Subunit: 205 residues, 8 copies
């Protein structure tokens, strides 16, 4: 593998002249108002990944923000509801072209109730994701090798999942449903930032 | 007030050359695959209402459906998540320009947890709606006077609520939030028809 | 109203040469092995009722048992699951031609979740049943007038509900589903007596 | 083990001139209106199995349906409440002569609260069923070897279970209870198809 | 009615040379280690009552304790599990000849799930007890007249209830069960004082 | 009752040269980051009240904040945990000399589980506060007379409650407990503002 | 581990002229009215056991019942609440001199919440009991060797536990509490048989 | 290791002329009024520990208590809410300079929901603490070697955790929050002793 570790921002976009980029984040917790962004992960799908450490109080990441803002590049997330919220809270730019593998899983893997990334990777690809480092100090000044390898491991497979999920969505005739869900997902994240994170806004009660 | 009761369909659209129409339905229950549409209510906001009795097995209602599919007319519902589902299930056309007073309530009446139509009308307009007839035989060949008056009372006030809620949404600066939620609402109803009625598609679990 | 009160048994069957008889019971509680049968109520639907006081330890009631065993007469209950159980446990005869207004309500009154007899009588007939005496000492040697009037009131109206429910079951094309449920109801009662009263035998868990 | 895989239908019924056939299904999920039938597996009890792939949108399987309809042949299921529902929804024929190992287990294996197929096969036969493939993509164009072997594994042992459960029902004198439950099971499945899937129709609440 | 109010203790036992005495207490709450005894009420059953105010830090009440210790007098309580605990904690004497109307109700009023004193008095005697003052400041130096009348109302009817419950226990042949329960009740109270107040010591879990 | 309504701030502190001031607030909801402070209520205990309307986006109120910052004046709240949070969030000043009647009630009224202000006022003073207006649009440009009267009602009685609670805390010897709770209360409110509003920080789980 | 297996009853009590006997039962389930007693195991504490197979419908076991009735012999159970109930229901003799290791554990092992026999034997004696056979067909005409060894394992250690628990009860000064609980235990079992198996007779609700 | 085991008290404080001491206790359970203190574990942070057995009824341990009350020495606990309560209940002295690793975890390890000592030690130091002996008979006159090694293991690592948590609290800017929580912790423990152990005193309900 190749994992390029950076401080603050990508040096340039030379490796990202592509149609879709897999994106993930790591934070200090589940509450964007309390838990700061610590890591941003990117991959072009070529089997390598970039891991960008975000400093405390960092307000800008121009190359990263260009990627997040570019409407011609689909950002692939797993449970993007969270990542979109924390990214918008941190850098002030809300992505609007997204694909979420968790929503896709809920729309296609109807034969199971386990939609976590580990189960998806195990079932669809026979790839073992190790989650031991998921609960670790992502704010450490120097990330461990195990942390760096885990962070890259979270983004290395999202392209293959998107390909398979697009096949399943086409087969079961949910393409327009999925497209509408992804179109609404950024606004669901915005509602999370504004204070309705514990509320299903569409529920009767 | 004036309540016009019809069999099958509106006679014409002479009374509905307006910018927005309030819409409600009555059914045999909460499950569209089991519980047929029995009554459709409409109002232009002029203090009169149309109550349309729908026959068993009726597949077509051209004037009503013509109104429902006119993209230049906003359809106002209370808890449109249900009504959109049953309308699309019955006539095969899903409206795509809607306003829902319950979503608006959840976005503006943040000081209460009661978002039912009775509580909203009581608080916002000091109008008392009596719900006694809500659980009644809406499939009766001849509706009683009490049933007809309840059905009209369900649609007579939605225009005034839309006006007030639009004022509140602009005042608290959540207009674009409401717009995005309303834009997504028809697909949420479609998801209900397809089999996800008990699932919040954006939740982690 | 006319209420004929008897000790032990009917004097004869002169008043019960009919197609259907409404039957109900009162007991000391919900557990047939602990709570003894105290009252049996009967009515032909002609506005009169028979109330039969059962003695402690009484094992036989030949006229009552002849009615309960007579396959040519349908026995109408409300929540017959219990009444069938207590009747079979007391007299050793399980009726097998029955109609239950609770099953019929659950199959037809799909627009509400309140299926008790008080609510059914209120909604279908505008008749007010008072339940204050439901929890009383039914084993008293002398029943009070309020007790006797309530006991008769439990059976005076089951014919009118059966007639209406039969109309609704025909209307929604659920006649065979209800008929099969009524056919199975006695074995559900036997399962209750044998010890599965707290178990839904068809559930996954 | 020989497992014969067919497309669409059996070529003939030469292997099924028997008094009882074990039947199971696999689907895309628990909701018959959304999740199509994908595989049907049968066995005569001779240690071999037939695995029939059902195509998307397939409406007919004349040989299979003739087998399912033959009243001289008892159909053995595990949790037939589901299989009967999905079979009737897909091919339009409701089997009416059935034996269910889950009902039998609940009526005889009263010393445990675990009635899943894994526990029954483990306790009664010391046979290890591996369920890893239960949650898999059963709609795949080509089934995997693991999928095929699991699907066959779900019918290979049902005859021996039926024999033992029949022994237990005779020993504990519960034969007529079980018979009435099995006679009613197809109507429970029909009720399931009609929209009462979440309701125990006999419960007080 | 006649209510004699005393400070600290009875002046003498001239009114309590009787076979059975009704006893009740009031405290500052449900936790004997935190909530001190404030009032003790007594009655000979003649329609009059004694209300004894207990002082802060009071360790002795010789005449009252003489009454509580005399094994030839049955002490009648409602929910004696609590009163025994608070009395033993306060005066160091655990009564051992008791009758509890709550246990008697649970052993006899099997036709209801409402075993409060208000409901019992309403059903068995048609006497209306008003509980508004049940939750009040019982530590006041001078009790209000409404408080005193409530306190007397708690003891005025326990003799009549004991007579009726003894009739019911004889009628349903449960006297020896009740007797064993009453003998164990003081040890249940001791278990409460020792720290097992939240544990059913006889439960499986 | 004299109620002075002001915009933005008190005109001066001529009426608040006192040793304790009753304070309460009204907002658009329970979430300080989403629901803005709308009204501040004050009372000197002289039977008059001041109601201060806070504008949207208002960042300063020098006279009010000077009063809130003054360590020689105890601020009396009911459920100050919330009021302290919203006040500190709005004006940037956290009061540090406080008394909370709800904590005091939980430390003294151990005989009840109802600690709301309405319930407290009913029990201790026999004064009926009507809360119908508690859930209303507090951000309206012009408050109704009923709203203003309710708002004054939430501060008019806190002094009298404080006097009674101080007597009870002295009587039951819990003064130092209450003092320590009040000393931590501002930090509990800060913890709420920082993101632990749903976490009991001292619980084991 | 000498294990003597008998049909119907012990031949005599020649091996049981001792002061205390360990007793445990096996049944078809938890409900004495439905599930019959299948096996009774006894031990004198000398490291050997007797396993007595009870036939369906067996009403008499004179030597065994003689042992159960001998008031000079303490019967040791684990969770005797169940065993006493099923023994009394089956043979008509209610033991009245008992020791229960579960009550003793709840009164002594206050540092844990896991009181099952496996955990007690593991912690207190470092002896491993294997519970695999607990859920098995105890009504088999011939028990397997594994069943026999498990059944003996249930009684082989109860004497040592009784010795240690008696030491702990003396040490912690809880002997009279335990004695009262053991004295009450037979009536708790009788209450289970009479129909209160789901009711805590001493609870407020 | 160098675990020194003592009866009753430390011989002197010659080894404890230090700025911070790790403290941990072992009891018979979670309820200080019932379950006595059995062991106190101390460490200077030098990799050695002192394990002090406390005798039944012992009220004094002057050298240990002198250390506990020396305000120039911070006492480090894990979940001091419990330890402080049992120490104060046993010896009558409440420490007032404390650090709690559970509060520190809840304020810093926001990326996990597991705050037990085992999980903290595993994550922060990669040290495996085995908790098998946590639930054991701590009142034995002679503790086993396994008990002694576990007891020392609970205190051997608290200094290293305090050092890391102090680094995290400074880095994340939460020192004044933690300081206020630690200042309130002794009053939370006092509240536990007084009877509010099950009440979060700051909650709305």
């Amino acid at each position: 593998t190749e994992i390029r570790v950076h401080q603050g921002d990508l040096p340039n976009l030379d490796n990202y002249r592509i149609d879709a980029v897999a994106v993930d984040t790591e934070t200090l917790g589940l509450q964007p108002h309390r838990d700061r962004l610590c890591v941003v992960q990117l991959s072009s799908g070529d089997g390598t990944a970039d891991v960008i450490q975000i400093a405390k109080g960092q307000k800008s990441a121009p190359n990263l923000v260009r990627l997040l803002s570019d409407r011609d590049i689909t950002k692939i997330f797993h449970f993007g509801r969270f990542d979109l919220a924390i990214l918008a809270h941190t850098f002030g730019v809300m992505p609007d072209v997204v694909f979420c593998t968790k929503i896709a899983s809920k729309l296609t893997r109807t034969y199971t109730d386990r939609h976590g990334l580990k189960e998806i990777c195990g079932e669809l690809l026979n790839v073992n994701i190790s989650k031991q480092q998921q609960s670790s100090d992502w704010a450490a000044e120097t990330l461990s090798r195990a942390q760096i390898e885990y962070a890259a491991s979270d983004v290395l497979y999202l392209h293959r999942l998107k390909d398979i999920f697009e096949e399943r969505l086409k087969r079961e005739e949910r393409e327009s449903v999925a497209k509408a869900c992804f179109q609404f997902l950024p606004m669901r994240a915005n509602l999370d930032l504004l204070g309705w994170s514990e509320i299903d806004i569409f529920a009767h009660s």
